[model samples]
Target: GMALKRIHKELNDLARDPPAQCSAGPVGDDMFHWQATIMGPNDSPYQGGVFFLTIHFPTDYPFKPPKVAFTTRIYHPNINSNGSIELDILRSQWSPALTISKVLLSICSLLCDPNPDDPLVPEIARIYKTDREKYNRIAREWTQKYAM
Candidate 1:
């Protein structure tokens, strides 16, 4: 379980030098399951909100990426109706070197710049791509109402 050992060490390091955008740590019965609280990117649809997420690592460890899901509901093109983010690195393209901290950073980046070209919700993607201002407004409103 080299990966688990590495993940354990990385989590401790992150705890000592936490990222600016979010806070993360182990949760529940097993330490393999972690939770994160991310501050929404400023000036984005999710601005001024705190987004929560769950990260569940597989027993196989770094060979597979952790399953991440939004505990806080959001409205975005790349996020599915159930609030699952559509980030490629978290799925098919995941690398063993990716850490929980790195994943959270990527999530923060995703909030700032959604990839509509690889969207989970097509309707949201269309609106996001065609009318960005309006999309931002809606995203901001949703953030205020749900996240705050």
Candidate 2:
């Protein structure tokens, strides 16, 4: 099947040449659902945090974008309270040309530099823009509490 072949290829390639600061694999033996981990970006409030995420690929994947969400809570404007990530590429801009490695890398980059103009948490975005010190401090606290 297309999904089986693609999934295996991606997994194999990932194992051989993993994306920076992130890795992904099946949650158990199920290939369609995967557990992904991303180490926090340096110089960010989440620097020491280890984030957990979920990726659910449709059987007709490559033609359809996988569903991705953070399973671990993070205090970021782009990440929702329930851990839903707000990114355009994951939604409208997704294409079959993109791979899991690229997706994971994009998410990791977002953790390094967020887009406050378009955010899942408007309050957090506001704080990020209006008072960066407060944003970083609270984000750090959350990292320590939930991600440490």
RMSD of each: 1.2, 1.0
What Cα-based lDDT does every candidate model obtain? 0.85, 0.91
Residue-wise C-alpha lDDT for candidate 1, range 7-90, written one tens digit per residue? 788789898998877988889556788898999887677878998888888887787888999989788888875778899889
Among the numbered candidates, top TM-score falls to 2
Single out the weakest 10-residue window by summed lDDT for candidate 1.
Answer: 1-10
Model 2 spans > 4 angstroms off = none
TM per model? 0.94, 0.95
Give the TM-score (vs. native) of candidate 1. Answer: 0.94
RMSD of 1: 1.2
- Please list all clashing residue pairs in model 1, or write none if there are none: none
Native-referenced Cα lDDT, model 1? 0.85
